[PDB]
């Protein structure tokens, strides 16, 4: 059975592409290597307390932190060394869900977008019609567990910040703070799974298959003939063809897509040779003379981040989220079960803030804070009251110059070959300035104490002793960046892979630089735009 589009990976990129292309009347197959996530996808991983609702760990926002503390987390991709979601929805089924509409600079030709992409408004608007921002996700309109917001707002107001409803004016971020915004609906996780996927699934020309892994595309030189999967019931020895004018879209995530390309003889020679080292994978490669040399996995960017941990007597650390699955506070559980209001209708973040920093190298960089009750890690030589802890996670985003590298190892695992954090010295300088500014007026808030790093350790000492791996912000972008030439990019303005007739990419890898805030809003706007460019590209099905 041939398809006009075969879309690999049911993450945000893939699902949006699948919806839009299927909406246009094209015969579309979406493939996903993992299984069900939320209730409506057939998921059954439900907390004891939540049983009657059928709402799973992925459905309930307040269960977010428990995605990291489960004894048996089947949702993480098992062959990637850093967090990636491998289930229906990808990262959007397991993420914090912080949702910021992209601003103009996020789509600027100055950060590497082609000119033809800079007018993101029509696409961003269109995104907002499917996934409206909310900073009060509880179905009663009220906000809950806000003590950390209240504390840090006072800190920030002393630093000259102003509060805003963040998504009302995306272009205005400097010295702004506000309640955390999410793409939730009816007090539950929503995202593309609850929207774009549902309108797709209603169409006779859309087919969705889960538990199917794509190893590689099959190609005759520049012409992609289809995909190779591990499911022999879908075609000869698992091969699924495209129609004659058909196209393959890769949306398997920064590590997923890069791996599929390497396994298809597309990417840096060192990576393809790594594939060739596995005799089985070697047999599926094109001959070496047809290998396409592109910077796949190069230019990898992720936010540097540093966690700062504090106590304040007004804080409610919510048992450090340790009990939300097996033994939640009865009133909170009851309230959520009844109508999906209360604590459980939001994830852990409560406050977000941003600040612009001039760069000695000419690049203006943005710092971002994400404030939540509780803390993953505490290193204090002094006693502290664990019921009073909260975290300020400080990131750099817009403007940073650091780049790393992702790829595969000899076992064909997606891995960080070169850590992308603080490669550029001016990025580190600005990060330390950003940290110093956050805590500059800590003494002006009575009872506010920084417990990691404690009083014995300076911010400079802390950053230098910090495990780089722990700086991972799960915001991988640019590993198959959009651009103008195969000398520095992997896809062109129509998100087509250089050197191919009909291979495309719609996932975070195409984004040329981190956006100002957490990236899923930027990605989803980009996916809308990508789908339009693909439909408008002549010679398609
Ligand atoms: C991992 C993670 C990510 C977070 C998180 N938090 C936020 C947040 O709060 N807000 C935000 O903006 N971004 C957040 N991010 C980032 C955001 O979720 C990601 O940037 C975003 O989901 C990336 O979308 P992509 O389309 O590039 O890729 P995904 O990994 O989401 O999806 C790929 C999918 O394809 C699949 N797939 C992969 N390889 C495949 C193969 N070979 N065959 C078939 N399917 C495959 C997957 O199983 C998966 O479903 C976070 O808490 C975690 C733990
Ligand atoms: O965009 C994001 N948003 C979410 C929400 O801010 C972050 O969640 C954090 O993710 C960390 C893991 O990366 C956890 O250890 C930590 O407890 C958790 O709060 C996540 O790291 C980040 O990628
Ligand atoms: C590759 O495709 C070209 C052009 O369609 C064709 O001439 C050739 O026979 C194909 N090669 C193989 C091995 O099928
Ligand atoms: C810990 O902090 C909480 C909230 O401030 C307070 O209720 C509790 O009594 C504190 N415990 C101790 C040891 O004082
Ligand atoms: C943990 O804190 C101690 C002081 O309490 C400090 O000397 C040590 O370096 C810290 N560890 C790290 C890795 O930052």
Swiss-Prot record:
FAD binds at residues 4-33. Keywords: Carbohydrate metabolism, Cellulose degradation, FAD, Flavoprotein, Heme, Iron, Metal-binding, Oxidoreductase, Polysaccharide degradation, Pyrrolidone carboxylic acid, Secreted, Signal. GO terms for biological process: cellulose catabolic process. Residues 3-541 are annotated as: Oxidoreductase. It comes from the Eukaryota. One of its GO terms (molecular function) is flavin adenine dinucleotide binding. It catalyses: D-cellobiose + A = D-cellobiono-1,5-lactone + AH2. It is found in: Secreted. Its EC number is 1.1.99.18. One of its GO terms (cellular component) is extracellular region. Its cofactor is FAD; heme. Binds 1 FAD per subunit. Binds 1 heme group per subunit. Disulfide bonds: none annotated. The active site is at residue 475. Degrades both lignin and cellulose. Oxidizes cellobiose to cellobionolactone. In the C-terminal section; belongs to the GMC oxidoreductase family. This is Cellobiose dehydrogenase. It comes from Phanerodontia chrysosporium (White-rot fungus). The chain holds residues 233 to 773 of 773 of the full protein.
